[PDB]
Scaffold this active site. Structure first.
Site, PDB file in Angstrom:
ATOM      1  N   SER A 166      89.099  57.218  43.446  1.00 23.31           N
ATOM      2  CA  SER A 166      89.283  58.657  43.385  1.00 23.31           C
ATOM      3  C   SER A 166      90.120  59.052  42.171  1.00 23.31           C
ATOM      4  O   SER A 166      89.585  59.333  41.100  1.00 23.31           O
ATOM      5  CB  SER A 166      89.935  59.147  44.682  1.00 23.31           C
ATOM      6  OG  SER A 166      90.117  60.550  44.716  1.00 23.31           O
ATOM      7  N   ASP A 191      88.534  65.928  40.890  1.00 22.04           N
ATOM      8  CA  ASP A 191      89.017  64.561  40.796  1.00 22.04           C
ATOM      9  C   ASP A 191      87.847  63.644  40.453  1.00 22.04           C
ATOM     10  O   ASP A 191      86.708  64.089  40.295  1.00 22.04           O
ATOM     11  CB  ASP A 191      89.771  64.150  42.069  1.00 22.04           C
ATOM     12  CG  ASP A 191      88.902  64.056  43.304  1.00 22.04           C
ATOM     13  OD1 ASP A 191      87.781  64.598  43.339  1.00 22.04           O
ATOM     14  OD2 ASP A 191      89.404  63.468  44.283  1.00 22.04           O
ATOM     15  N   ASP A 235      86.011  61.257  41.799  1.00 21.41           N
ATOM     16  CA  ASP A 235      84.842  61.138  42.669  1.00 21.41           C
ATOM     17  C   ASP A 235      84.387  62.491  43.194  1.00 21.41           C
ATOM     18  O   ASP A 235      83.518  62.552  44.069  1.00 21.41           O
ATOM     19  CB  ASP A 235      85.123  60.165  43.819  1.00 21.41           C
ATOM     20  CG  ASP A 235      86.275  60.590  44.733  1.00 21.41           C
ATOM     21  OD1 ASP A 235      87.136  61.421  44.368  1.00 21.41           O
ATOM     22  OD2 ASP A 235      86.320  60.049  45.860  1.00 21.41           O
ATOM     23  N   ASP A 258      85.185  64.776  45.224  1.00 28.30           N
ATOM     24  CA  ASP A 258      85.275  65.377  46.545  1.00 28.30           C
ATOM     25  C   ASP A 258      86.389  66.421  46.643  1.00 28.30           C
ATOM     26  O   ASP A 258      86.484  67.090  47.667  1.00 28.30           O
ATOM     27  CB  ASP A 258      85.427  64.303  47.630  1.00 28.30           C
ATOM     28  CG  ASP A 258      86.640  63.418  47.434  1.00 28.30           C
ATOM     29  OD1 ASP A 258      87.331  63.529  46.396  1.00 28.30           O
ATOM     30  OD2 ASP A 258      86.898  62.593  48.337  1.00 28.30           O
TER      31      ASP A 258
HETATM   32 MG   LIG Z   1      88.624  62.208  45.593  1.00 25.71          MG
END
Ligand SMILES: [Mg+2]
Ligand SMILES: O=P(O)(O)C[C@H]1O[C@H](CO)[C@@H](O)[C@H](O)[C@H]1O
Length: 448
Positions: free
Chosen positions: A97, A237, A239, A241
């Protein structure tokens, strides 16, 4: 005595001493023993080690007779979406992440992208992996490559009426994470003019690790918005999400206020629905949800609690102040993409700037933002706070730590489940002065 990489909600550690290809293969084997019947979706983020960790995961899964659906380089929400969409037994995203360069990790889900957490299978996997000294077996199942994002993209676009969208100019800042791939695939279907910052995926992270909460990374999006006259800016961020919003003045919008804003956006489409929120900051969300005709549902913070409560309530939307937004039709999972599509639609349809959509809410319910404390004795510090305020007789709620409601102001004080920290949030009824004096008072008590 315990593998440190196994955390409350996911796996995360330094490569290669805390996480490596051998552990990853062992995790694949152990995951196979924990899931119901079906294949397993695998995806990964832009980090340099992520492909090799995914391949080791796949090798363990297939040694255990699990077919593997390799969705390739993706965002974490795509593992959630494809796990549910393809009716898979589970899925794993290889990602750290926002963590530093030498770190990686995994996010695990079972059927319908339901989370696998420490108390719902992850520590069972850890203990199996920890004791597993068996020779690696050979693959008895296949891997199929399914990189088609068509269903995922159509699902994202289904949240907005594209004929109502205006050609807004939007700054987008992938932070050299993975969000830019999805933006570019959405763009032929949208009227927006994109201003792309730190857009290319680069696991070396030449512009800093992807964390829009660091003020220096924040300022890259702010400056691009101001310099280009953009309607608003979005940053993710690594990734993606989590998404983060900047209004036309370059101002970063505190995530608290996006919960009420997205709830009103969604409740316009899904009248009377339930909306799940966390206990840290509440008053604004309760009011906005109720004014939109929805029903607010208080829930402990943490994505697994939010998702479970959303399911039991058939809640259409859930939002946390920490930049996590969850959508029933998205397998009750979080998306860093749906939120900005919804905000773009709200700005297009209302004729109001993002700034004006939140300004009165920020004045009506000013908040401290989350303040973290690393203290010598968390329990003693919390007791010092509560003893100081006891004579005011606050209304106390223990859903998630301690919530104390004094009438014109309230706070939440809880221990993090992912770090040895105390987290503090304060808000008031339209009183910035009270907000500051109480925040500083609590801060001094915590640090005492
Ligand atoms: Mg994330
Ligand atoms: O460390 P905490 O505060 O217990 C948990 C933190 O990470 C979780 C998963 O990313 C979030 O859902 C939660 O809102 C956040 O406070």
């Amino acid at each position: 005595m315990t593998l440190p990489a196994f955390k409350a909600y996911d796996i995360r550690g330094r490569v290669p001493d805390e996480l490596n290809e051998d552990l990853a293969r062992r995790i694949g084997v152990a995951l196979a023993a924990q899931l119901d019947q079906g294949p397993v979706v695998l995806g990964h983020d832009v980090r340099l080690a992520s492909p090799a960790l995914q391949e080791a995961l796949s090798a363990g899964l297939r040694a255990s007779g699990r077919d593997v659906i390799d969705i390739g380089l993706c965002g974490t929400e795509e593992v959630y979406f494809q796990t549910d969409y393809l009716k898979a037994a589970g899925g794993v995203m290889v990602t750290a992440s926002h963590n530093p360069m030498d770190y990686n990790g995994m996010k695990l889900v079972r059927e319908q992208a339901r989370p696998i957490s420490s108390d719902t299978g992850l520590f069972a996997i850890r203990d199996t992996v920890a004791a597993d000294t068996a020779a690696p077996g050979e693959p008895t199942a296949s891997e199929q490559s399914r990189t088609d994002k068509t269903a995922y993209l159509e699902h994202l676009l289904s949240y907005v009426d594209r004929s109502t969208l205006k050609p807004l100019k939007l700054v987008v800042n992938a932070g050299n994470g993975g969000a830019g791939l999805i933006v570019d695939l959405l763009a032929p279907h949208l009227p927006f003019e994109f201003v792309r910052v730190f857009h290319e995926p680069d696991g070396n992270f030449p512009n800093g690790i992807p964390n829009p909460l660091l003020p220096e990374n924040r300022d890259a999006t702010a400056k691009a918005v101001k310099d280009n006259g953009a309607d608003f800016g979005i940053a993710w961020d690594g990734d993606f999400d989590r998404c983060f919003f900047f209004d036309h003045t370059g101002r970063f919008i505190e995530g608290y206020y996006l919960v009420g804003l997205l709830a009103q956006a969604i409740l316009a489409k899904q009248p009377g629905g339930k909306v799940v929120h966390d206990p840290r900051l509440t008053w604004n969300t309760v009011e906005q949800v109720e004014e939109a005709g929805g029903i607010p549902v208080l829930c402990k913070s943490g994505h697994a609690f939010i998702k479970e409560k959303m399911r039991s309530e058939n809640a259409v939307y859930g939002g946390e102040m920490s930049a996590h937004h969850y959508f029933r039709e998205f397998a009750y999972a979080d998306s860093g993409m749906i939120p900005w599509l919804l905000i773009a639609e709200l700005v297009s349809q209302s004729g109001r700037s993002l700034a004006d959509l939140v300004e009165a809410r920020m004045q009506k319910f000013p908040c401290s933002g989350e303040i973290n404390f690393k203290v010598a004795d968390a329990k003693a510090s919390v007791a010092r706070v509560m003893e100081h305020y006891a004579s005011l007789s606050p209304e106390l709620d223990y859903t998630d730590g301690i919530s104390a409601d004094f009438g014109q102001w309230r706070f939440n004080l809880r221990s993090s489940n992912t770090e040895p920290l105390l987290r503090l949030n304060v808000e008031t009824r339209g009183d910035a002065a009270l907000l500051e004096t109480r925040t500083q008072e609590i801060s001094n008590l915590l640090r005492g």
